[PDB]
């Protein structure tokens, strides 16, 4: 069967990470061949850049058109920039097909999307003096890049509006963890640990996958292929049920980008606020088949998700020490990946 997957993308700087490339990665995720309620996309923005927030907003709106198109016509790859680069053979058709008509309209929609993103980048090139202001009229909470509250915004999903055929889309979650002078943030490693916790509060999928912001999914069946291995030339795979044992794999395994791996392996254990002072998160670590308690409102969940990204959350905890992505510059050569402990079940499937 098909287990839920939480997909993590970390970004920091739209000037080094062009918004359109990130958008293409996100669109290839949102259009993946998978039940929409069982794939979720979390984008961490450590730059707290309004440009990234707004380009992700525009991206979700375009996804509402792009996703049903790809699924109707079995498009590959589902990153529009790369799909539209491939040449099509119009001469083999006597008359314009429904596919060709739909594709010509989709391509101009994509060109228009691109122009809007270019406009966002241009406007970002030069500050106004009072900092940025949002749709509302209210100021952008991340104007001070090193001194700003935690921000979470859920797009699409169950309550985020339908695609062009009237169907729900996967959740897309913007996350910018809190930053305050006097608190270390540990860069990507700290972002990934924050995303482990945010995802656990909001979806808590048994499997996690971390993609670079330019690593678009090339084959929409990638998650199904992974599940063919994870549930009872070639790519990297690992399976282990560890007990006791001078036998078998000894010690932890570390996993980086592009691999689906099982979440509970992160929680590998030696109280329980080695995990930090979140009742909701600690409870989530105890559900062996994932999910969230049915009686939590998106509103209370958004509480809890904000709490788990506060800048002091990891103080007095094992995060970055023995749990999650591990902090370094001492002995441990990680923060090249998540630490999967021996204790129980471990499984990894990496994409080609
Ligand atoms: O605060 C941050 C910084 C980076 N990243 C992510 O981590 C990855 C690394 O990108 P990079 O531009 O290399 O970030 P750096 O913090 O600068 O990490 C580098 O810092 C040195 C100087 O840039 C480099 O020589 C090293 O390759 C590397 O450790 C990207 O996916 C980034 O989105 C975050 O999530 N949060
Ligand atoms: Mn810390
Ligand atoms: Mn990355």
Curated annotation (Swiss-Prot):
Keywords: Cell membrane, Cell wall biogenesis/degradation, Cellulose biosynthesis, Coiled coil, Glycoprotein, Glycosyltransferase, Golgi apparatus, Lipoprotein, Manganese, Membrane, Metal-binding, Palmitate, Phosphoprotein, Transferase, Transmembrane, Transmembrane helix, Zinc, Zinc-finger. Residues 100-124 form a coiled coil. UDP-alpha-D-glucose binds at residues 10, 16-17, 46, 187. Palmitoylated, in part by PAT24/TIP1. Expressed in young plants, flowers and roots, and to a lower extent in leaves and stems. Localized in all cells except meristematic cells. Accumulates particularly in root caps, root hairs, epidermal layer, midveins of leaves and anthers. Not present in old tissues. GO terms for cellular component: endosome; Golgi apparatus; Golgi membrane; plasma membrane; plasmodesma; trans-Golgi network. Changing residue 258 to E: In cev1; reduced amount of crystalline cellulose in roots. Residues 1-352 are cytoplasmic. GO terms for molecular function: cellulose synthase (UDP-forming) activity; protein homodimerization activity; zinc ion binding. Disruption phenotype: Mutants cev1 are dark green and contains more jasmonates and ethylene, that leads to shorter and thickened hypocotyls and roots, with prolific root hairs, and the accumulation of purple anthocyanins. They exhibit constitutive and high expression in leaves lamina of vegetative storage proteins (VSP1 and VSP2), basic chitinase CHI-B and plant defensin PDF1.2. In addition, this mutation confers resistance to powdery mildew pathogens such as E.cichoracearum, E.orontii and O.lycopersicum, to the bacterial pathogen P.syringae pv maculicola, and also to the green peach aphid M.persicae. GO terms for biological process: cell wall organization; cellulose biosynthetic process; defense response; plant-type primary cell wall biogenesis; plant-type secondary cell wall biogenesis. The active site is at 46, 333. Mn(2+) binds at residues 188, 212. It is found in: Cell membrane; Golgi apparatus membrane. Changing residue 189 to V: In eli1-2; reduced cellulose synthesis and aberrant deposition of lignin. Catalytic subunit of cellulose synthase terminal complexes ('rosettes'), required for beta-1,4-glucan microfibril crystallization, a major mechanism of the cell wall formation. Involved in the primary cell wall formation, especially in roots. Homodimer. Interacts with CESA1 and CESA6. Interacts with STL1 and STL2, but not with GOT1. Binds to CSI1 and CSI3. Interacts with PAT24/TIP1. Belongs to the glycosyltransferase 2 family. Plant cellulose synthase subfamily. This is Cellulose synthase A catalytic subunit 3 [UDP-forming]. The gene is CESA3. The chain holds residues 334 to 784 of 1065 of the full protein.
């Amino acid at each position: 069967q098909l287990a839920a997957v939480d997909i993590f993308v970390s970004t920091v700087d739209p000037l080094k990470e062009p918004p359109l490339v990130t958008a293409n990665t996100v669109l290839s995720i949102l259009a993946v061949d998978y039940p929409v309620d069982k794939v979720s996309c979390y984008v961490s923005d450590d730059g707290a850049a309004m440009l990234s927030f707004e380009s992700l907003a525009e991206t979700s709106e375009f996804a509402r058109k792009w996703v049903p198109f790809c699924k109707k016509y079995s498009i590959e790859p589902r990153a529009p920039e790369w799909y539209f680069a491939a040449k099509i053979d119009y001469l083999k058709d006597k008359v314009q097909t429904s596919f060709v008509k739909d594709r010509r309209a989709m391509k101009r929609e994509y060109e228009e999307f691109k122009i809007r993103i270019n406009a966002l980048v241009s406007k970002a090139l030069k500050c106004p003096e009072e900092g940025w202001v949002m749709q509302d009229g209210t100021p952008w909470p991340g104007n001070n890049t090193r001194d700003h509250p935690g921000m979470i915004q859920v797009f699409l999903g169950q309550n985020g509006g339908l695609d062009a055929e009237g169907n729900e889309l996967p959740r897309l979650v913007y996350v910018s963890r809190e930053k305050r002078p006097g608190f270390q943030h540990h860069k990507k490693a700290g972002a990934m640990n924050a995303l482990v916790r945010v995802s656990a509060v909001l979806t808590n999928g048994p499997f996690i996958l971390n993609l670079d912001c330019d690593h678009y999914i090339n084959n929409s069946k990638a998650l199904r292929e992974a599940m063919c291995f994870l549930m009872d030339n070639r790519n990297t795979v690992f399976f282990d049920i560890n007990l006791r044992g001078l036998d078998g794999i000894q010690g932890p395994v570390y996993v980086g980008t592009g691999c689906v791996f099982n979440r509970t392996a992160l929680y590998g254990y030696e109280l329980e606020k080695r995990f930090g002072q979140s009742a909701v998160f600690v409870a989530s670590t105890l559900m062996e088949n994932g999910g969230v308690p049915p009686s939590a409102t998106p509103e209370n969940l958004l509480k809890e998700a904000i709490h788990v990204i506060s800048c002091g959350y990891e103080d007095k905890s094992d995060w970055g020490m023995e749990i999650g992505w591990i902090y370094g510059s001492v002995t441990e050569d990680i923060l090249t990946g998540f630490k999967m402990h021996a204790r129980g079940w471990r499984s990894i499937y990496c994409m080609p």
